[PDB]
Structure formats: C-alpha cells, structure tokens
C-alpha cells in the first residue's frame, strides 16, 4: 500500500526537518566576556591593581 514514487516526498520532509535542526545546532556559545565573571582573575594577581587615569 506504499508505492515507491512516494518515498522522495518523505525524504524531502525529513531533509527539511534535519535542516531546521542543524541550522540551530550549528550555532554554539562562545567564551564568556563578562568582567564580573573574571574580576577575581585580576583580584588574584601577584600585584595590586593600578587604577591609572
């Protein structure tokens, strides 16, 4: 009850689905740049921080 010509339609559907998946999963989160997350890297330096202006 399933002819062979109807298969590429299903293949098109699944290709659309997996492309909608991969266009999202191709994105990834980079390294964090918030200074509040890395202020202790500077707090723990071997010398005190110079606020130079």
The residues binding other proteins (CB under 8 A) are 32, 34, 36-37, 40
Rounded Cα gap, residues 24 and 50, in angstroms = 43
Q: How far is CA 18 from CA 4, 28, 48, in A?
A: 22, 17, 53
Q: Minimum Å distance from CB 39 to other proteins?
A: 9
Q: Minimum Å distance from CB 36 to other proteins?
A: 5
User: Please, which residue, 37 or 50, has the CB nearer to other proteins?
Assistant: 37
Rounded Cα gap, residues 15 and 24, in angstroms = 14
Q: Minimum Å distance from CB 10 to other proteins?
A: 36
């Amino acid at each position: 009850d399933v002819p062979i010509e109807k298969i590429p339609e299903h293949a098109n559907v699944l290709l659309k689905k997996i492309d909608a998946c991969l266009e999202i999963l191709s994105k990834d989160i980079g390294e964090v740049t918030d200074a509040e997350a890395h202020e202790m890297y500077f707090e723990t330096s071997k010398f005190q921080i110079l606020h130079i202006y």
